[PDB]
Design an enzyme around this catalytic site. Structure first.
Site, PDB file in Angstrom:
ATOM      1  N   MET A  53       2.398   4.927 -49.211  1.00  0.00           N
ATOM      2  CA  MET A  53       1.633   4.326 -48.110  1.00  0.00           C
ATOM      3  C   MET A  53       2.488   4.042 -46.866  1.00  0.00           C
ATOM      4  O   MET A  53       2.220   3.106 -46.110  1.00  0.00           O
ATOM      5  CB  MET A  53       0.908   3.058 -48.588  1.00  0.00           C
ATOM      6  CG  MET A  53      -0.156   3.333 -49.634  1.00  0.00           C
ATOM      7  SD  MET A  53      -1.487   4.364 -48.987  1.00  0.00           S
ATOM      8  CE  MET A  53      -2.396   3.150 -48.028  1.00  0.00           C
ATOM      9  N   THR A  69       2.402   1.677 -43.885  1.00  0.00           N
ATOM     10  CA  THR A  69       1.394   1.957 -42.822  1.00  0.00           C
ATOM     11  C   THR A  69       1.930   1.541 -41.462  1.00  0.00           C
ATOM     12  O   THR A  69       2.425   0.430 -41.295  1.00  0.00           O
ATOM     13  CB  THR A  69       0.064   1.216 -43.081  1.00  0.00           C
ATOM     14  OG1 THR A  69      -0.541   1.716 -44.284  1.00  0.00           O
ATOM     15  CG2 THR A  69      -0.909   1.400 -41.907  1.00  0.00           C
ATOM     16  N   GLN A  70       1.834   2.448 -40.495  1.00  0.00           N
ATOM     17  CA  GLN A  70       2.188   2.144 -39.116  1.00  0.00           C
ATOM     18  C   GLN A  70       1.191   2.819 -38.182  1.00  0.00           C
ATOM     19  O   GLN A  70       0.180   3.371 -38.621  1.00  0.00           O
ATOM     20  CB  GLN A  70       3.614   2.614 -38.768  1.00  0.00           C
ATOM     21  CG  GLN A  70       4.506   3.017 -39.934  1.00  0.00           C
ATOM     22  CD  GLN A  70       4.259   4.448 -40.375  1.00  0.00           C
ATOM     23  OE1 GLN A  70       3.120   4.839 -40.632  1.00  0.00           O
ATOM     24  NE2 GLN A  70       5.325   5.238 -40.458  1.00  0.00           N
TER      25      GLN A  70
END
Ligand code: BO2
Ligand code: MG
Lengths: 244, 240, 222, 204, 235, 212, 231, 195, 233
Positions: free
Chosen positions: I107, I1-2
């Site tokens: 993810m 996730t970013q």
């Protein structure tokens, strides 16, 4: 590839013997004689240092008798370096048991554990076995005073009196002759030293060529004391028994 | 890790390492198993080359795997401990998951499977041990007696012997054991087991061990004097 | 924070006949209030006389169909070109779905075909793999609009015979392929009227012993 | 919730003329519930004494761990471990659990057998050594103990006088803490004799 | 020494060829396939009379529709059977159906060549895998330690195999009944066995579509032995 | 969901409802909440549909492997413990299961084990599991005896599910009956609640609150 | 001699004997023929039985809708390699939506077989393969040897007595290459080619095995009464 | 589960444990035995999170039974309690800890003394004359503080235990459906069938 | 996730009778800051495919490198690399689609929306979409971000269904694309005047136009707008 150079340490002979175990026992037969004698009121451990020198510092030296815990000790016969590897493993095992159950490890359980480690090297891993035979002298509240022996095969047995290393055949015959069941520690001390004095390859048995130890209930009231004898104390007991 | 294939086939279709493991069993002290109508008896030889022994603490030849099953063996003593330990662990694991103790056949099948695994695994040699596994299944009064060997094959026996001079005692059992009418009592079964060992043992003093297993976890080891009485009665009948 | 799931809308419908089976689905694809495509096929011929559709999150839907088509291919390789029966396909799909129990395929799966006796068959799945053979099933966005209509007009629920007044039920007479297609078209026309994610086009796949046939019908594009 | 104050308890140590003293309360509880009045927190390995406050499961675990380590030390070294050396061993052992620590407040006390010099030391839960000349405190009533020790203490006290000082420091600190008390023990330590005294205190 | 996976100058794997010699020393096992079922029979070969023969398990169930007979180092077969049972049940779990006899055999044969320097050597046991499925009907397979499997109308493995195979060559036809096949296995077993054939040192089994895989009772086999003796004395 | 099972003279009665819901939406009225593990074992399903279905058909595979290996029918105790040990491995991951493992063996007799996704495993005579379990318990506890006829026991189970189907919003559809005896289980039909309610009301004189 | 104990050892003349011994296993195997035109590619395989009661060992394996092979030698090794091809054909389809080129399929097999010839412990594959296929550049025929060497050909044959069929194809080269849009005649030529390798035995209904792939023809295998037409 | 009590008298240890099992709103069972025999002279009662309790108890049981067979010898209650504590102390820093509290009641045949150990899920061990887990101790310790005497007979211990259960039945909100009582002495373990 | 940092806005595209057109502006935004004014977001692959990318620019450059590497890899041991075994639009898309869905499943997504425009071997028009979620779809017109809301409506008036594709010439299609780009400049607060356009025709091949500007803008009416209601001056 690498198969070319593999000795295959863990195989059977056509006769059903383990080559490396047999050859390790041959090695041990040239090691200094160690004797263990069990009495009603204690246990004796006696052992012969191998051809020493006058310039060897004896009072700080230890090659035969080792302390595993406060209740259990061992006499070594074979490669000292190999023995110390196993001794440190045994010391740890005793401490693990004490931490887990909050009780001192029973002698047989410690013996079985070390003997199982030795067995492993004869069945798997492709490594050479430990060239060591032990005499275990110990006490617990189940069986009381106990003597055991283990060898490179990983097999162990219990004894009233036993010898390992050099001249065991001659030594065992002498012990079998003079040993009695109602014997005491002071008598067992005399028997151990007399047996070494007759089986030794040296010209004479002296204090500087010996390591000695007792496990006595001769401690103030219901408890057990280990005594690793000092050079001067070995000299005195040699005079007392009338060998020097 | 050490991966070397030690147990391998030979041109004539033999696995020598497994066969040499049987030679180690041949060297081991004799062990015998006899099952009666309502019991099983396990007899074992103690070589008298070793005196000055402490019989209290010396490892006994017959080992309890659970309260209802026992295991005796012939061959390498150190190797036998490893099989016994695994068997004891599996016995408790079976109770834990199945909520029932092992059958004698199941325990035998497990020990035999371990032995087999060591005949085609890299870096390991076969066990130099044959076992006699005896007992009674839970809530069952039928006696059970099984044998295993280094190769991993196992089978059930009315009576069987393993170890040194086992060829002789098997000869004795084959003529003396009747299937239509097995030893009806404990006495008869123990007597036949002691008789079979007396064909090989030497002296009937501290050289014979006897262990009787009865249904419902009733296991007891006979003492020197109790066995000595069997030895006395057998020879007095023989003097005729 | 990143959200790995999305909702592509759409709606699907499976009906099992006496010797046939249909699997229908609208061709609209959406995100939020926008149309991505007015014609994006959603019901697929997977071979062995089996049709399949995985409605909901299209990325997971495409992934699943792709993996099942793959499973059919390897079933032929591993088992001597044996025909994969509809019941076996259903069980296989359960394991594909449950294999991602803790990070699910966010789809409502329906398959249709014929069973081993030649009778029409429809199977229905939830996202995590629970399944059940059914005579009738709608899935997706407008499933709540269509299912009650199908309970009434396919299984004759709450319908009785005139004159008896609630005593005698309406008999469960079988429906032809022409009769089923009428009910499918009306279901989607009705759903299109009241559900914003349904429209553009209707694509029906019919399965018989002869094979898999297709029919397409225009739907309202608003 | 806070691991260091679930079970409760205190330890205090002091130096005197040719002597040291270490003392602790006997309470073990589950928050408000008093469970045990025999839970001693002072242990000894040879002539080196260790007191441990905080989470009781860790108090027990660490005692077993240091018994383990001091026993191996003695077998290899062929001598009993000294207070200075043991202090370093505690610090090492605690810091190896830097990011998953034992929730404890250890206190070392003893006399060096060779030099005869009195020695005390305290630690935080992760290994930091506090080697004070005068006194060390630990536990749920550490604030109270600091106040008592800082006022009552004077240097070079004789063993029997030091007993009174440390006992009054513990007792009055414990009585101002809900999770401490339920009895107390005091060790007076000289070079070759150690006296252990149980104190009579209020049981609430 | 030499590699375990080494080829001979003739293009054969030494270890595989040596395991085949071990199988020749094994006890005889015979299988016959008919349109009414498949029959499997074995020689028990007890080493001593004190050995309880009923504990000798050389015929084994894999699933309700698949049975198996073995010959050679029979201890090696236990892990093969375990794998076969697991494969059969696993396929039923994944596909809600019985597994094809050929597919089961193929799964077992995939283990065969997984040896090197995985297990340390090939299997020293051959298997006769008999079963039924809806696609290919009644089937009999011969699974070797080479990883190869052949389908057979009839097959014999073990010590008396080439003598038994020659007998099966003449006797087998496509219209054999199940009763005829049972007697035929007993006949050929009696021919190649060292000891005299009876219900205690020989075992029969069959697989039919209706009843599935069944090991025969000693009482049931005894009758078929008596029926055999009479029909041979009839001419 | 409402599922029950109880021991009695004639063996075990197992009764379940048929409804499945997603929130307030009725997803299915024709759900098979009983699983035929083998001719002697039954498993009930409550909580997550997939979890129950998947792991109970998996349980049947493990039971089949047991009797292939051991040449003997698996005990109800062992079968239940395989499932409870499995779900215990997944504890915390979010499995949602409430199940009864019902069967008969020679050594045990008729036996019921409650097995649950928290790892709970309980032997017992009577169990009710699901959102409508409390409603079923009312009828069962007041009418239960050991000395019930197969016919009367079956009706009690049917009636207890009906009670819960009526009151519990997340139970309904139809009632599936099973009877487990010495010689295995026996299916006793699908009973639509829409027809069963009015039948029971008229014949039994119950539900006087409702108008018909 | 002293240099054939394992695959990791060159001989003094630069030979790899274990690889050569693996090549020998192919020569012991039953004959199989491969040939192609511009529109179609055909495999013909003589199946071998153990005895009269036994079945005839299958020789041809399907890898994809557009590709497959015939084997000669250790059948389990053919199963491992065909399984690898199946996966690679499948990877190409799933990831790139692209039917795997026959030439690239040969390159992958070559590289897989090679690793087994340079490392200690392992062994070479004991089987030879004839791969046929129809891709974007038309019909193809490959010959795989377990040394790693892969060769694209108009026609070929491997196995016992394969030299007879290989000579026939070398004469017929100009004729059979021109057989376009006529599958039956291309098979006839393949059946006539494999017939040049027969001795004593002849082509029966359960003996013969044929496979074909082409322009509008998926890879299909013919056995039993389906090949009686060509006998 | 809910209430587990323990009391050590002159010549025995008495353990009392509730019979109820409640999941949410319903009492699924009213005859549950919350105890396992670890060895002939050692009994362990337990209470905590569902599933974890039984799984842990049986896991300990299996390990002690394994020890007994291997050594042909029964471990002391002190030794068993230490083994149990270490398992829980190991457990508390695991991915998913055992959420189980136990009482271990045993008779040491060597010292001829009854022994009661209280251990919580953190691995907090204490030897006690009387003990309890959960909210039980909040009611029962005051009675035991008054009435307990180190030299009570087993019959006197049971009477004092009845007084504890009566107080719990009066003041606790949860209906725990009575208790199963078990006595541990020199002759082994037995259950009081009428309580 | 970013989170996406440096970002690119709309990519728009449509089919016409003989091929496909695709366009995207040359801006790299850093939040509300219009940081980089010379960013090429259309990346050609061979002479038959153009990949238009929106969203995170660092991820775009990663994807650019994957495509560059894909061409290199396809040439390896491939004598027909510039002919029958050349990279097709369908191959390039499926590869990207695989990567996008794999990355969302770990993810750790590539924060982009991608349109692959091109012409196949048989002359068929290829136009398909894929994004950070691995979601894919095809349509006669495709657009990302703001384009989806503003461009698609305009482009759908030219090609409303499949049957309108043969009736649409390249001149009419390009006119519609250029107009859509103007509208996006009026109304998208993260757009620029400068853009690039690419045409892939089955006859004339790949035409890549750089440094295009939005022109013919209507602003004159602004002078008459005063205040927010009541104000007259
Ligand atoms: B029952 O209500 O527990 C029922 C049993 C299940 C095996 C079908 N469960 C459900 O209906 C659950 C929701 C639920 C409601 C009340 C309590 C617990 C759970 N539904 C599902 O699992 C489900 C499955 N597929 C589609 C929709 N819902
Ligand atoms: Mg609409």
């Amino acid at each position: 590839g690498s198969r070319r150079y593999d000795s295959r340490t863990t195989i059977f002979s056509p006769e059903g013997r383990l080559y490396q175990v047999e050859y390790a026992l041959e090695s041990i037969s040239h090691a200094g004689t160690a004797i263990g004698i069990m009495a009603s009121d204690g246990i004796v451990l006696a052992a012969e240092r191998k051809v020493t020198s006058t310039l060897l510092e004896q009072d700080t030296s230890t090659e035969k008798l080792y302390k595993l815990n406060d209740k259990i000790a061992v006499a070594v016969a074979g490669l000292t370096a190999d023995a110390e590897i196993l001794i440190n493993t045994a010391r740890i095992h005793a401490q693990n048991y004490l931490k887990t159950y909050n009780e001192d490890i029973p002698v047989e359980i410690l013996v079985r554990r070390l003997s199982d480690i030795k067995q492993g090297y004869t069945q798997h891993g492709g490594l050479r076995p430990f060239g060591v035979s032990f005499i275990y002298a110990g006490y617990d509240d189940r069986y009381g005073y106990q003597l055991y022996t283990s060898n490179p095969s990983g097999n162990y047995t219990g004894w009233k009196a036993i010898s390992v290393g050099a001249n065991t055949s001659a030594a065992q015959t002498l012990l079998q002759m003079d040993y009695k069941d109602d014997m005491k520690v002071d008598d067992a001390i005399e028997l151990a030293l007399k047996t070494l004095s007759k089986t030794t390859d040296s010209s004479a048995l002296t204090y500087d060529r010996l390591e000695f130890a007792t496990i006595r209930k001769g401690a103030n009231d219901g408890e057990v004391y280990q005594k690793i004898f000092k050079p001067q104390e070995i000299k005195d007991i040699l005079v007392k028994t009338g060998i020097t | 890790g050490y991966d070397r294939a030690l147990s391998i086939f030979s041109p004539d279709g033999h696995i020598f390492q497994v066969e040499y493991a049987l030679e180690a069993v041949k060297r081991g002290t004799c062990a015998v198993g006899v099952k009666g109508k309502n019991c099983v008896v396990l007899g074992c030889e103690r070589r008298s080359t070793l005196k000055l022994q402490d019989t209290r603490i010396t490892p006994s030849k017959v080992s309890k795997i659970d309260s209802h099953v026992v295991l005796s063996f012939s061959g390498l003593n150190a190797d036998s401990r490893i099989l016994i330990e695994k068997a004891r662990v599996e016995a408790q694991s079976h109770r834990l998951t199945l909520e029932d103790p092992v059958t004698v056949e199941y325990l035998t099948r497990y020990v035999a499977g371990v032995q087999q695994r060591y005949t085609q695994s890299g870096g390991v040699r076969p066990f130099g041990v044959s076992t006699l596994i005896a007992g009674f299944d839970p809530r069952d009064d039928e006696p059970k007696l099984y044998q295993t060997e280094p190769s991993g094959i196992y089978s059930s026996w009315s009576a069987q012997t393993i170890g040194r001079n086992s060829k002789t005692v098997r000869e004795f059992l084959e003529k003396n054991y009747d299937r239509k009418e097995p030893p009806a009592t404990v006495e008869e079964c123990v007597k036949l087991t002691v008789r079979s060992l007396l064909e090989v043992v030497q002296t009937g003093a501290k050289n014979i061990e006897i262990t009787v297993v009865k249904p419902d976890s009733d296991i007891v080891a006979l003492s020197s004097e109790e066995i000595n009485q069997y030895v006395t009665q057998i020879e007095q009948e023989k003097q005729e | 924070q990143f959200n790995p799931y999305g909702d592509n809308g759409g709606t699907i419908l499976g009906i099992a006949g006496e010797d046939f089976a249909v699997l229908a689905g609208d061709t609209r694809n959406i995100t939020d209030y926008s149309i991505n495509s007015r014609y994006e096929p959603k019901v697929f011929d997977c071979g062995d006389n089996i049709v399949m559709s995985a409605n909901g999150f299209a990325a997971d839907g495409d992934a699943l169909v792709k993996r099942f088509k793959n499973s059919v291919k390897w079933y032929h390789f591993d088992h001597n070109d044996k025909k994969l029966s509809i019941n076996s396909a259903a069980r296989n799909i359960q394991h594909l779905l449950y294999g991602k129990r803790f990070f699910p395929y966010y789809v409502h799966t329906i398959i249709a075909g014929l069973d081993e006796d030649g009778k029409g068959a429809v199977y229905s799945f939830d996202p995590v793999g629970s399944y059940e053979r059914e005579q009738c099933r709608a899935g997706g966005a407008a499933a709540s609009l269509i299912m009650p209509f199908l309970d009434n007009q396919v299984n004759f629920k709450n319908q009785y015979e005139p004159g008896t007044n609630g005593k005698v039920k309406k008999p469960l007479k079988y429906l032809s392929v022409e009769e089923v297609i009428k009910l499918v078209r009306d279901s989607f026309t009705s759903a299109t009227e009241r559900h914003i994610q349904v429209g553009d086009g209707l694509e029906i796949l019919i399965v018989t012993k002869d094979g898999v046939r297709k029919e397409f019908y225009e739907l309202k594009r608003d | 919730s806070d691991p260091s104050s679930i079970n409760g308890g205190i330890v205090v140590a002091m130096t005197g003329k040719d002597c040291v003293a270490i003392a602790c309360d006997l309470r073990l509880g589950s928050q408000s519930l008093g469970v045990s009045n025999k839970f001693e927190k002072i242990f000894h390995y040879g002539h080196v004494f260790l007191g441990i406050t905080g989470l009781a499961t860790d108090v027990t675990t660490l005692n077993e761990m240091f018994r383990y380590k001091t026993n191996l030390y003695k077998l290899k070294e062929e001598r009993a471990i000294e207070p200075e050396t043991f202090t370093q061993l505690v610090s090492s052992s605690l810091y190896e659990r830097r990011f998953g620590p034992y929730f404890v407040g250890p206190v070392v006390a003893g006399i060096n057998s060779k030099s005869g010099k009195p020695f005390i030391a305290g630690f935080d839960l992760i290994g930091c050594i506090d080697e004070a000349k005068d006194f060390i405190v630990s536990g749920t009533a550490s604030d109270q103990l600091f106040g008592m020790c800082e006022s009552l203490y004077e240097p070079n006290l004789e063993p029997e006088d030091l007993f009174e000082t440390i006992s009054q420091a513990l007792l009055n600190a414990a009585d101002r803490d809900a999770l401490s008390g339920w009895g107390a023990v005091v060790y007076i330590i000289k070079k070759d004799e150690v006296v252990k005294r149980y104190l009579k205190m209020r049981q609430d | 020494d030499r590699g375990v996976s080494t080829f001979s100058p003739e293009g054969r794997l030494f270890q595989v060829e040596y395991s085949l010699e071990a199988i020749k020393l094994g006890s005889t096992a015979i299988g016959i396939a008919t349109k009414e079922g498949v029959v499997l029979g074995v020689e028990k070969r007890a080493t001593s009379p004190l050995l309880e023969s009923d504990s000798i398990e050389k015929i084994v169930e894999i699933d309700r529709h698949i049975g198996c007979a073995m010959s050679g180092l029979t201890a090696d077969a236990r892990s093969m059977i375990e794998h076969a049972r697991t494969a059969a049940v696993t396929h039923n779990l994944y596909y809600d159906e019985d597994i094809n006899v050929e597919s089961l055999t193929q799964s077992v044969c995939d283990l065969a060549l997984r040896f090197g320097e995985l297990m340390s050597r090939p299997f020293g046991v051959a298997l006769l895998i008999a079963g039924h499925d809806a696609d290919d009907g009644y089937q009999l397979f011969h699974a070797e330690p080479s990883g190869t499997f052949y389908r057979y109308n009839a097959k014999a493995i073990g010590s008396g195999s080439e003598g038994a195979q020659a007998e099966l060559l003449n006797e087998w036809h496509s219209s054999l009944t199940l009763k005829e096949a049972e007697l035929l296995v007993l006949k050929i077993l009696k021919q190649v066995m060292e000891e005299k054939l009876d219900e205690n040192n020989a075992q029969l089994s069959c697989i039919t579509k209706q009843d599935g895989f069944k090991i025969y009772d000693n009482e049931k086999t005894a009758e078929l032995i008596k029926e055999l003796k009479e029909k041979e004395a009839a001419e | 969901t409402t599922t029950l099972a109880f021991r009695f003279q004639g063996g075990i009665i197992v009764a379940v409802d048929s409804r499945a819901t997603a929130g307030n939406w009725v997803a299915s009225q024709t759900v098979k909440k009983v699983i035929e593990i083998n001719p002697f074992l039954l498993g009930t399903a409550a909580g997550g549909a997939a979890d129950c279905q998947f792991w109970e058909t998996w349980l049947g595979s493990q039971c089949r492997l047991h009797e292939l290996r051991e040449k003997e029918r698996i005990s109800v105790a062992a079968a239940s413990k395989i499932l409870s040990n499995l779900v215990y491995q997944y504890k915390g991951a979010g499995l949602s299961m409430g199940t009864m493992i019902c069967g008969y063996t020679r050594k045990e007799g008729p036996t019921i084990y409650y097995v649950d996704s928290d790892g709970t495993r309980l032997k017992g005579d009577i169990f009710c599991v699901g959102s409508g379990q409390t409603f079923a318990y009312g009828v069962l506890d007041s009418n239960y005896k050991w000395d019930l006829s197969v016919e009367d026991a079956l009706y009690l189970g049917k009636r207890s599910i009906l009670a819960a189907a009526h009151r519990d919003a997340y139970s309904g559809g139809s009632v599936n009956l099973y009877h487990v005896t010495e010689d295995g289980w026996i299916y006793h039909g699908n009973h639509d609640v829409g027809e069963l309610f009015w039948k029971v009301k008229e014949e039994e004189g119950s539900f006087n609150n409702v108008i018909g | 001699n002293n240099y054939d104990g394992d695959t990791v050892t060159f001989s003094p003349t630069g030979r790899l004997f274990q690889v050569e011994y693996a090549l020998e296993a192919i020569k012991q195997g039953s004959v199989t023929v491969g040939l192609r035109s511009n529109t179609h590619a055909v495999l013909v395989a003589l199946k071998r039985n153990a005895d009269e009661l036994s079945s005839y060992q299958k020789k041809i394996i399907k890898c994809d809708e557009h590709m497959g092979l015939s084997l000669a030698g250790l059948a389990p090794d053919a199963r491992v390699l065909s399984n690898y091809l199946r996966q690679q054909c499948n990877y190409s389809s799933l990831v790139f939506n692209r039917k795997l080129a026959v030439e690239r399929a040969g390159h992958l097999l070559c590289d897989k077989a090679q690793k087994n010839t340079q490392s200690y412990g392992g062994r070479p594959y004991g089987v030879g393969l004839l791969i046929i296929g129809y891709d974007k550049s038309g019909a193809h025929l490959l010959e795989f040897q377990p040394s790693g060497n892969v060769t694209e050909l108009y026609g070929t044959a491997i196995g016992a007595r394969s030299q007879g069929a290989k000579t026939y194809l070398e004469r017929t080269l100009d004729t059979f290459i021109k057989i376009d849009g006529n599958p039956d005649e291309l098979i006839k030529a393949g059946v006539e080619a494999i017939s040049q390798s027969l001795r004593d035995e002849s082509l029966t209904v359960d003996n013969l095995s044929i496979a074909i792939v082409g322009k509008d023809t998926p890879f299909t295998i013919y056995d039993g009464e389906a090949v009686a037409k060509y006998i | 589960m809910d209430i587990i009590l323990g009391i050590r008298v002159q010549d025995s240890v008495i353990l009392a444990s509730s019979k109820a099992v409640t999941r949410g709103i319903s009492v699924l069972k009213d005859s549950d035995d919350k105890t396992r025999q670890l060895s002939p002279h050692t009994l362990m009662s337990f209470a905590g999170e569902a599933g974890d309790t039984v799984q842990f108890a049986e896991y300990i049981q299996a390990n002690i039974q394994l020890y007994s067979i291997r050594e042909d010898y029964e471990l002391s209650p002190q030794a068993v309690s230490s083994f149990v504590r270490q398992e829980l102390a190991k457990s508390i820093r695991s991915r998913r800890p055992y959420q189980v509290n136990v009482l271990i009641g045993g008779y040491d045949k060597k010292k001829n003394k009854p022994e009661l150990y209280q251990i919580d899920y953190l691995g907090t061990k204490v030897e006690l004359p009387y003990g309890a887990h959960g909210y039980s101790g909040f009611y029962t310790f005051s009675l035991l503080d008054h009435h307990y005497r180190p030299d009570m007979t087993t019959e006197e211990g049971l009477d004092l235990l009845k007084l504890c259960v009566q107080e719990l039945e009066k003041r606790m909100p949860m209906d725990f459906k009575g208790v199963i009582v078990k006595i541990v002495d020199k002759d082994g373990i037995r259950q009081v069938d009428d309580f | 996730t970013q989170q996406p940092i440096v970002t690119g806005t709309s990519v728009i595209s449509m089919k016409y009778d003989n091929g496909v057109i695709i366009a995207a502006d040359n801006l790299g935004s850093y939040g509300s800051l219009l940081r980089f004014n010379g960013v090429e977001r259309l990346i050609p692959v061979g002479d038959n495919t153009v990949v238009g990318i929106s969203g995170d620019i660092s991820d775009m450059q990663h994807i650019e490198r994957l495509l560059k590497d894909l061409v290199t890899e396809n040439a390896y041991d491939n004598p027909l690399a510039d002919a029958e075994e050349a990279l097709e639009p369908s191959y390039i898309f499926e590869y990207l689609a695989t990567v996008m869905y794999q990355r969302r499943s770990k993810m750790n997504p590539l924060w982009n929306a991608i349109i692959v425009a091109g012409v196949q071997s048989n002359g068929d028009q290829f136009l398909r979409y894929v994004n950070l979620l691995g979601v894919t779809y095809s349509s006669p017109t495709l657009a990302t971000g703001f384009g989806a809301h503003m461009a698609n409506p305009l482009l759908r008036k030219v090609v409303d269904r499949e049957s309108d594709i043969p009736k649409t010439t390249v001149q009419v299609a390009e006119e519609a694309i250029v107009n859509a780009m103007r509208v996006l400049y009026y109304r998208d607060a993260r757009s620029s005047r400068n853009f690039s356009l690419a045409i892939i025709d089955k006859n004339t091949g790949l035409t890549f136009k750089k440094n295009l500007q939005v022109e013919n803008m209507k602003w004159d009416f602004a002078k008459d707008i005063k205040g927010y209601g009541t104000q007259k001056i």
